[PDB]
Amino acid sequence: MFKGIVQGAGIIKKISKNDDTQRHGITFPKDILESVEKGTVMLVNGCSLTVVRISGDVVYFDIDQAINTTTFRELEVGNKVNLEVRPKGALTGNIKGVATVDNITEEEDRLKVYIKIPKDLIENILSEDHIGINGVSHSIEEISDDIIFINYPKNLSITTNLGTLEKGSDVNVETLN
Numbered sequence: 266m267f268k269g270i271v272q273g274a275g276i277i278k279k280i281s282k283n284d285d286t287q288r289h290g291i292t293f294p295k296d297i298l299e300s301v302e303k304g305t306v307m308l309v310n311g312c313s314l315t316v317v318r319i320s321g322d323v324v325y326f327d328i329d330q331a332i333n334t335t336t337f338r339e340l341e342v343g344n345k346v347n348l349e350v351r352p353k354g355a356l357t358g359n360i361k362g363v364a365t366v367d368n369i370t371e372e373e374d375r376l377k378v379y380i381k382i383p384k385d386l387i388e389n390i391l392s393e394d395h396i397g398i399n400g401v402s403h404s405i406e407e408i409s410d411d412i413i414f415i416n417y418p419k420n421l422s423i424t425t426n427l428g429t430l431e432k433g434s435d436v437n438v439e440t441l442n
């Protein structure tokens with residue numbers, strides 16, 4: 266299990282597609298880079314994936330088991346992804362659905378994010394529950410029907426991909442408890 270506190274942002278450097286599988290090469294920050302090796306199981310946008318190789322600061326993962334139930338299929342070279350190495354709140358790295366951002370509102374110190382949750386998940390989500398969105402675990406301010414409202418501190422953008430999100434952005438969600 267993981268904290269759901271993002272350690273740093275990686276940048277997708279390469280994507281190779283070969284038969285309902287994709288290999289993503291992701292440029293890592295040095296500290297996170299020094300904490301991983303081939304075989305490391307870590308969180309990428311909140312999803313458990315296994316490091317299959319490393320070349321320089323580029324860390325590669327094969328997306329195959331996760332390919333139909335995560336946002337990886339739709340990501341592009343240059344996209345930022347959240348990273349967390351394994352040490353509530355606590356995230357397992359089993360993504361429960363792909364949700365879509367409904368609205369992002371930027372204010373002076375906050376990022377107000379509204380996310381349309383898959384219908385199959387909404388019956389077990391109340392306001393004030395913790396939820397993982399791309400591996401950031403934070404509480405829900407409100408839910409009305411299938412839309413959840415999370416109010417993030419804007420400073421979270423220096424260590425995460427939250428500042429890159431807009432309406433229509435898909436996200437990995439992990440429901441807790």
Ligand SMILES: Cc1cc2nc3c(=O)[nH]c(=O)nc-3n(C[C@H](O)[C@H](O)[C@H](O)COP(=O)(O)O)c2cc1C
Pocket residue numbers: 306312313314315316326327328329330331332334335358359360361
């Ligand atoms: C130890 C661990 C390592 C995993 N490594 C990968 C992997 O490298 N590639 C992948 O596609 N899925 C991997 N998975 C599976 C994804 O985490 C999983 O498919 C996704 O979170 C949850 O979606 P699912 O239940 O629809 O499969 C791993 C799971 C675990 C527990």
